[PDB]
Design a protein around this ligand. Structure first.
Ligand code: 7FL
Ligand code: 7FL
Lengths: 10, 235, 241, 11
């Protein structure tokens, strides 16, 4: 789990 | 198959110019003299808010969205400080001796002395800004250099599609120089000078990365969770 | 100045004529590998390589026209970069292997004998696979080395002291013309010349990254007091921290 | 500096 994952999908 | 390779050189410039992140502001408390924790706290807060725009700027870079989510994470994790620095250097172009971190936050060499080891990186950043000013770096050239940093800095730390886009930006950079009237000899000479500066931006990033790793170990200026993720990706 | 009047074909001749030899290692295949032994071999190798690099730098066009203090600065910041690109160059036709010497071929398993060095081995291997993928030529490799010598320390610098900084860019642009002349003879179109010129200089960003990562690794093993560094390597290492 | 001597070494 990475915050960078969420910011790239949203 | 992506759509970046099909775009025209002018369509490549327009897409990059339209994806430019905004110039953010720092916190508005007027305290021109800074301590070590005061200056790093402002830059950390600014850099954290700049990362959010950079992530959305990267998604609007032609060819980047056509990458795997993991490949997107890898490129941003290795190039994020390079992208911040080349943006800082670009904003400080018409401010010699000053570093325009924000329109309300200009720092000189003496400011960087309030944080140990950071005045050395200040000189490198100011030298790169004076180098951009000497070359008359155009905004169309700057957006190309930023996207090159994003796609190249982590392409060997893993690929064929990335080099296809990197060649497309090369064609785009040559297109701009040929439009400005530069001769063929002046084109690949200016292209070489621009790309050689990227080696120093990488150097400043590695030096800055160690500086942030020292600040983390000091544990005085609290880093954001997003900054700790981008920082931990360099070990 | 001599370097400004050199023809591109004469520029290649000067760089190729000045190439340092490929020194051998003191490696004994009967001796198994260890952390203190492997870094000891590479330290002895890189130390003897430095002597030839210093004399190689003198034979680079334009380098003699610089100040003695400027020559010290350029070598101090680029010495590990020049060692690494030569290492990557020698290992081009040995996939998965790093040819530190003709009698020293190391893969990823040997790199793990030293803590943290395996990550740098992968970057060097990827750079060699990149050189092999691009089919890099020796005429282009010697051009890239001399570029690293002049460029890696040109932005880390008397108002007239910047006039020599302007002379360094004159030689840098001269080497750029040489690369384009080489690619034109190889049957590459102007579009292919610009692309290959860009690809080559983009690799120099990774070479700088590997040097910075390798420079920190040498500083860590120095404070470890496990592998003694030579007196010259200590001088080159202290210049980066 | 050792780098000083070797660069300065003419003969
Ligand atoms: O636009 C920016 C560019 C760089 C930096 C920055 C730099 C650090 C490297 C030392 C020199 C100052 C630049 C920084 C500061 C704090 C932080 O938590 C993350 C990045 C901030 C904004
Ligand atoms: O041709 C060479 C290039 C690099 C190295 C080298 C490397 C260090 C960076 C980590 C990966 C190994 C290569 C090294 C090792 C020990 C030393 O005292 C100085 C340089 C030796 C020869």
């Amino acid at each position: 789990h990475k915050i960078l994952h969420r910011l790239l999908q949203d | 198959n992506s759509l970046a390779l099909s775009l025209t050189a002018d369509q490549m410039v327009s897409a990059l110019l339209d994806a430019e992140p905004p110039i953010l502001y720092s916190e508005y408390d007027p305290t021109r003299p800074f301590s070590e924790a005061s200056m790093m706290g402002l830059l950390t807060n600014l850099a954290d808010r700049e990362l959010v725009h950079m992530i959305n700027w990267a998604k609007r870079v032609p060819g980047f969205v056509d990458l795997t989510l993991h490949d997107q994470v890898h490129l941003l994790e290795c190039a994020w400080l390079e992208i911040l620095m080349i943006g800082l250097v670009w904003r400080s172009m018409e401010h010699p001796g000053k570093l325009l971190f924000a329109p309300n936050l200009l720092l000189d060499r003496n400011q960087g002395k309030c944080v140990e080891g950071m005045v050395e990186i200040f000189d490198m950043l100011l030298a790169t800004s004076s180098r951009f000013r000497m070359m008359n770096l155009q905004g169309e050239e700057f957006v190309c250099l930023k996207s090159i940093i994003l796609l190249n800095s982590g392409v060997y730390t893993f690929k064929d599609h990335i080099h296809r886009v990197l060649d497309k930006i090369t064609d785009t950079l040559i297109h701009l120089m040929a439009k400005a009237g530069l001769t063929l000899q002046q084109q690949h000479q200016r292209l070489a000078q621009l790309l050689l500066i990227l080696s120093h931006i990488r150097h400043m990033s590695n030096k800055g990365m160690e500086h942030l790793y020292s600040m983390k170990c000091k544990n005085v200026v609290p880093l954001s969770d997003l900054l700790l993720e981008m920082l931990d990706a360099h070990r």
